[PDB]
Design a protein around this ligand. Structure first.
Ligand code: HEC
Ligand code: HEC
Ligand code: HEC
Ligand code: HEC
Lengths: 79, 80, 80, 79
């Protein structure tokens, strides 16, 4: 949920609507919602980070567990 | 409010009156006093950071919600 | 002390009990409780940061004097 | 002063004794104290940043006035 995103520092680089560092959470939801295994995909990206999907700036790996990454993916996709 | 600003780590770089890494809060309050869109303007600056208004060193973006950014903006603008 | 910790920005990444970006203070206290040289060890880590103890995310170095690092270490150790 | 250094965020990368990001202040004092124009030289580096003198990691420019840069240099040199 949003409280968890805040607790894990996600909002430093992601706003719900504005572009900061990574994509707006509302934009991620638009891209992936309804797509097969969107939750599992996004959970992996949240924990491990990555580059090249939204731009050339990498997202670093994050101090989140698998269960946390899944909760955050579920929350994001619900926007 | 002040405790929120301290909790978020804003005082690592800002003081009420002293010039640290970023501008004093009182100096931000003075600069934007009376501007109709000061809260919304500063809220965005608090969320996103920025450069070039006060100096050449950029402020990093901040781990805040829209509601928190609004509260911090309102608090800052209240400083005499 | 807690207020120093907040002022320096430590609470941006650490909570007393919750697991944020860095380990909870209570968990640090538990791990190093009764270890001699705990204070000197944690002071070093507060000044210099590091990684690999709690996760693969590095803690950045911190804007603290050696005296402040030792104060913050002693406060963290007391969280039990 | 050590108080102005902390106030300006300098201690995040510099310790008096230990190596963090930039050189320990005690080591900078050893290299420059008693050299011609050491205050002006260091003040310029403090305000404008630089790289290659102590290693390959650049120091960024700093939000300090000229007076603050010269006071910081004088303090460092006294160590
Ligand atoms: C900067 C230091 C970041 C932090 C902290 C977090 N994120 Fe991130 N994120 C960032 C960038 C630059 C990008 C785009 C990477 C790219 O491939 O272009 C992202 C991306 C995401 C995504 C979408 C990934 C995808 O493959 O589509 C998600 C779902 C995401 N980020 C979530 C997220 C969470 C939950 C975070 C806190 C644990 C988090 N990010 C932190 C930059 C940064
Ligand atoms: C350094 C690591 C900072 C932290 C942490 C915070 N701020 Fe900041 N801030 C910093 C600088 C170097 C600047 C000047 C940027 C520039 O344009 O020259 C700022 C600026 C602000 C402002 C003024 C914005 C403007 O006038 O356009 C505000 C209102 C502000 N900062 C607030 C703020 C808050 C609430 C913070 C914690 C959530 C915060 N800052 C952290 C450096 C740093
Ligand atoms: C994120 C930008 C952080 C800030 C700001 C602070 N800390 Fe931190 N800390 C962070 C991480 C990611 C970790 C884990 C590092 C690892 O080894 O995996 C830590 C760790 C600590 C520790 C424990 C060190 C150890 O057991 O070896 C302590 C005692 C600690 N942090 C204290 C501390 C203080 C006092 C801070 C303000 C000066 C501070 N931290 C800021 C992330 C971040
Ligand atoms: C990292 C984000 C830094 C901050 C903040 C400050 N300094 Fe720095 N400094 C840093 C590095 C990596 C280096 C070495 C650069 C190189 O050429 O190898 C330095 C260097 C200095 C020096 C010596 C300069 C020289 O010998 O040419 C001084 C005197 C110095 N730094 C002082 C200083 C002050 C006063 C700061 C706060 C205003 C400050 N530094 C911040 C990294 C970083």
């Amino acid at each position: 949920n949003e409280q968890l995103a805040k607790q894990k520092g996600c909002m430093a680089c992601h706003d719900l609507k504005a572009k900061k560092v990574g994509p707006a959470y509302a934009d991620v939801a638009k891209k992936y919602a309804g797509r097969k295994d969107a939750v599992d995909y996004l959970a992996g990206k949240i924990k491990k980070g990555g580059s090249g999907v939204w731009g050339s700036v990498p997202m670093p790996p994050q101090n989140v567990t698998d269960a946390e990454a899944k909760q955050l993916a579920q929350w994001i996709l619900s926007i």
